[PDB]
Amino acid sequence: CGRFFQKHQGTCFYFGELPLSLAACTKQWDVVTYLLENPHQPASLEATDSLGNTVLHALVMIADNSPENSALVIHMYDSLLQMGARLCPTVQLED
Amino acid sequence: CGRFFQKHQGTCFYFGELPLSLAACTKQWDVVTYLLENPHQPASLEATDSLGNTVLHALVMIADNSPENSALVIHMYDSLLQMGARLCPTVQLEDICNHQGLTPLKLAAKEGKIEIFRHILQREFSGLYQPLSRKFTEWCYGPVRVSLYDLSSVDSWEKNSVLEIIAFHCKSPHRHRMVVLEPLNKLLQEKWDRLIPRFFFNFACYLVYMIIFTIVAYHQPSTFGDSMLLLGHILILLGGIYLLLGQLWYFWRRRLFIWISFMDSYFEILFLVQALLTVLSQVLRFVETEWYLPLLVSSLVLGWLNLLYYTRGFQHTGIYSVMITKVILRDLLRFLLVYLVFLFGFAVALVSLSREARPVPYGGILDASLELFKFTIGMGELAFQEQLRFRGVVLLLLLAYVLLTYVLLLNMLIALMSETVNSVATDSWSIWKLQKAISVLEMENGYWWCRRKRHRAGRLLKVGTKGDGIPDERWCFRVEEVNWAAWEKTL
Amino acid sequence: QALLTVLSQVLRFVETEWYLPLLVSSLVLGWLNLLYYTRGFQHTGIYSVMITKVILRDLLRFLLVYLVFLFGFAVALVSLSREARPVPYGGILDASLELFKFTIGMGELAFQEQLRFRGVVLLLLLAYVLLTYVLLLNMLIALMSETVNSVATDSWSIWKLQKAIS
Ligand SMILES: CC(C)CCC[C@@H](C)[C@H]1CC[C@H]2[C@@H]3CC=C4C[C@@H](O)CC[C@]4(C)[C@H]3CC[C@]12C
Ligand SMILES: CC(C)CCC[C@@H](C)[C@H]1CC[C@H]2[C@@H]3CC=C4C[C@@H](O)CC[C@]4(C)[C@H]3CC[C@]12C
Numbered sequence: 001c002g003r004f005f006q007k008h009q010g011t012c013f014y015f016g017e018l019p020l021s022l023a024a025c026t027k028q029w030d031v032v033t034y035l036l037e038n039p040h041q042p043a044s045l046e047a048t049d050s051l052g053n054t055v056l057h058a059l060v061m062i063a064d065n066s067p068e069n070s071a072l073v074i075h076m077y078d079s080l081l082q083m084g085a086r087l088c089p090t091v092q093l094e095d
Numbered sequence: 096c097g098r099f100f101q102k103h104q105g106t107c108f109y110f111g112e113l114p115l116s117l118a119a120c121t122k123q124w125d126v127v128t129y130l131l132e133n134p135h136q137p138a139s140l141e142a143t144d145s146l147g148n149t150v151l152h153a154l155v156m157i158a159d160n161s162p163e164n165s166a167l168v169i170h171m172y173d174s175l176l177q178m179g180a181r182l183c184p185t186v187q188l189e190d191i192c193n194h195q196g197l198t199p200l201k202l203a204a205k206e207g208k209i210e211i212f213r214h215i216l217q218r219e220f221s222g223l224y225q226p227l228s229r230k231f232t233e234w235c236y237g238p239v240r241v242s243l244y245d246l247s248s249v250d251s252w253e254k255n256s257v258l259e260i261i262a263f264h265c266k267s268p269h270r271h272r273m274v275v276l277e278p279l280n281k282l283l284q285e286k287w288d289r290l291i292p293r294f295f296f297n298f299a300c301y302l303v304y305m306i307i308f309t310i311v312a313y314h315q316p317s318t319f320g321d322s323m324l325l326l327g328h329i330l331i332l333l334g335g336i337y338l339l340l341g342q343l344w345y346f347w348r349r350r351l352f353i354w355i356s357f358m359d360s361y362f363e364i365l366f367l368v369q370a371l372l373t374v375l376s377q378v379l380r381f382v383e384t385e386w387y388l389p390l391l392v393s394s395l396v397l398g399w400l401n402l403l404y405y406t407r408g409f410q411h412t413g414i415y416s417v418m419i420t421k422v423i424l425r426d427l428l429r430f431l432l433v434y435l436v437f438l439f440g441f442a443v444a445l446v447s448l449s450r451e452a453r454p455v456p457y458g459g460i461l462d463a464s465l466e467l468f469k470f471t472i473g474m475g476e477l478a479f480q481e482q483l484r485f486r487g488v489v490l491l492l493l494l495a496y497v498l499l500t501y502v503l504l505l506n507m508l509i510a511l512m513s514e515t516v517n518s519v520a521t522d523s524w525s526i527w528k529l530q531k532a533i534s535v536l537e538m539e540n541g542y543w544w545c546r547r548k549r550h551r552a553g554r555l556l557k558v559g560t561k562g563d564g565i566p567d568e569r570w571c572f573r574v575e576e577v578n579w580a581a582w583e584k585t586l
Numbered sequence: 587q588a589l590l591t592v593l594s595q596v597l598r599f600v601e602t603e604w605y606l607p608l609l610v611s612s613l614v615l616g617w618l619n620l621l622y623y624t625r626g627f628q629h630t631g632i633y634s635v636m637i638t639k640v641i642l643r644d645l646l647r648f649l650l651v652y653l654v655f656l657f658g659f660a661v662a663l664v665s666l667s668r669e670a671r672p673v674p675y676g677g678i679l680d681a682s683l684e685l686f687k688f689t690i691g692m693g694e695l696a697f698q699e700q701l702r703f704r705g706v707v708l709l710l711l712l713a714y715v716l717l718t719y720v721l722l723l724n725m726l727i728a729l730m731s732e733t734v735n736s737v738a739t740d741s742w743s744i745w746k747l748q749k750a751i752s
Contacts, residue, residue, distance in 0.1 A: 013239045069579040312665045389706045392662040399658030415647045422725055473691040513728040
């Protein structure tokens with residue numbers, strides 16, 4: 001959490017202030033995957049931030065109406081939803 | 096140097112009157128290369144000609160707005176720049192002046208050539224040949240990317256900048272297209288944003304002056320009140336003198352704009368005329384001449400149109416004001432020409448007719464013209480005059496005028512205005528942006544009595560190290576952007 | 587409308603003379619709300635949306651320019667024509683009313699013979715007519731044509747959102 005990381009008017013880029021959120025927003029499916037199957041300590045896919053946003057909220061926040069950004073956020077959203085289904089099929093992330 | 100080789104109107108082809116310039120302009124990279132590595136005598140790449148142009152100036156001169164020519168001149172320009180870097184890395188070719196005083200970048204601005212101008216203004220190369228670049232991409236943390244544009248010889252802080260050349264020196268008709276490109280667009284916008292208070296302060300001062308003028312003109316006859324009237328009159332005299340001095344100073348500073356610029360400014364003449372009329376009326380009052388009042392009311396009329404001048408400070412109203420003048424110029428004058436040709440003949444026919452019976456309507460030419468104009472203003476008296484001897488002929492002439500000037504011409508004028516408004520949508524935006532640029536450039540300088548201090552734009556960002564020493568400093572303008580396609584391409 | 591109606595009704599109890607203007611203002615404003623209720627059909631709903639979009643996009647610039655033209659010419663006409671060789675253009679309101687009669691199609695354009703500056707007055711009137719009536723009104727028609735052409739598809743979605751809100 002910092003001035004550059006919060007959403008304001010100026011020099012900033014909000015990504016969810018989470019390593020998993022950053023990896024998802026930066027278009028790397030391999031890094032997102034690897035954080036999840038760590039034997040040491042897996043990254044919880046339902047963790048939140050100061051604003052309370054999750055990995056799925058952050059993707060919505062960084063979304064634009066441009067074609068490429070929309071395609072990227074759609075694909076990442078679907079992939080993360082499937083990954084949440086295979087990891088944790090009890091809790092549903094959409095609600 | 097010869098008649099065929101100089102730039103004139105007729106049979107000519109200017110190429111720089113140099114073998115190296117000819118080879119560069121004739122699309123042969125091998126010949127250009129070979130002239131440079133001759134053991135006998137290499138061809139100096141910084142040599143000039145009678146006009147003083149170099150190899151880079153000549154490429155700018157022969158440039159056109161066609162795609163193929165623009166691509167050729169761009170590629171040759173970049174190749175020659177790299178070749179100059181490898182041969183002579185001490186001297187830089189871009190800042191070589193001319194006999195006129197211009198650089199290759201300033202020639203592109205003054206000659207109205209836009210493709211090479213936009214390419215030179217924003218260029219970036221790969222890892223090799225960094226120093227000879229204008230746009231530099233700084234940190235790329237995620238999809239947000241920050242660009243740094245070189246502000247050298249393009250910032251209005253210097254004496255003869257690119258913006259001043261475009262606004263007051265370019266001969267091209269469509270010279271506004273150059274002020275709506277990236278760097279200039281952003282820089283001009285922030286300059287205008289910094290200049291809102293002074294612009295609206297000038298507007299308020301002019302509004303107060305016009306209110307005082309209106310009050311003085313209204314409360315004037317054919318003590319305290321007399322003292323206030325005299326104070327108002329002398330204040331108007333000084334205000335008119337001030338406006339006249341300002342207009343004269345503006346005309347003297349840019350002696351040669353009056354041919355290039357009429358579509359965009361066209362208010363300096365109006366301000367000059369208003370000031371002259373006001374001063375002339377005020378001085379003529381001292382003689383107690385009867386022609387005071389017409390001159391005073393003419394100045395009163397012309398003042399509020401300059402108030403409309405001050406109104407072009409917003410996007411909607413500015414484009415509307417541009418469109419008004421463009422509609423006036425493109426199609427109002429043809430309609431007036433045809434209208435008066437119709438009016439004069441019909442009025443003369445009506446006057447010559449209806450002089451014998453069986454006051455008097457159509458007594459003279461002025462009365463007939465007034466009646467026929469009442470027809471177009473919607474107040475035409477169309478009656479069957481019974482006392483006339485040629486009643487049917489008069490009625491037929493009136494009907495023929497009505498169905499041929501009122502039904503046809505006015506509605507056709509409406510249609511032509513519709514077409515004109517449809518056709519010039521995108522042009523008015525650029526014209527208004529150029530108008531804002533001119534206003535900003537004028538406000539950057541002070542008034543004719545006080546000069547503002549030049550506020551430099553951009554920050555002093557280090558852009559690395561050159562091959563001559565450790566420091567390499569240049570003033571750059573920063574712009575942020577959030578681009579997702581470009582970011583995803585670079586991985 | 588509700589505030590004006592309630593204020594007029596309560597002001598009647600005081601027997602104040604400003605009852606009737608407030609009551610007639612409420613009466614005027616009621617039928618425009620009746621037009622509110624009219625946006626229940628596709629054609630009329632999109633028409634109502636287009637009316638407001640034409641008003642917002644281009645009616646205000648025209649009024650601004652129109653009043654700037656009107657005020658200066660009216661003041662010039664009032665300051666002029668105060669000496670001879672009732673009286674037309676007696677004050678600012680009368681001059682404004684005459685110049686507006688010009689745009690409503692009832693402009694009295696005559697060569698006043700009793701004035702001392704007949705030619706100047708006639709030239710000013712002609713310059714107002716050919717610059718406000720011929721130019722500005724027809725240009726306004728053209729701008730409305732362009733606006734109606736440009737916003738065809740947007741009004742449908744705006745009306746659908748209006749239905750959703752209702
Ligand atoms: C009685 C006389 C002095 C008033 C008539 C004005 C005369 C000078 C004519 C000549 C050229 C005309 C101007 C040229 C075009 C414009 C730009 C437009 O955006 C506002 C109206 C305005 C400014 C016109 C107003 C009328 C005009 C000024
Ligand atoms: C004498 C006075 C009270 C009557 C004039 C009405 C006043 C309030 C003005 C101000 C804003 C205007 C309204 C704004 C826009 C619309 C929507 C349009 O689809 C119907 C007309 C209508 C409703 C206008 C009617 C006139 C209006 C209501």
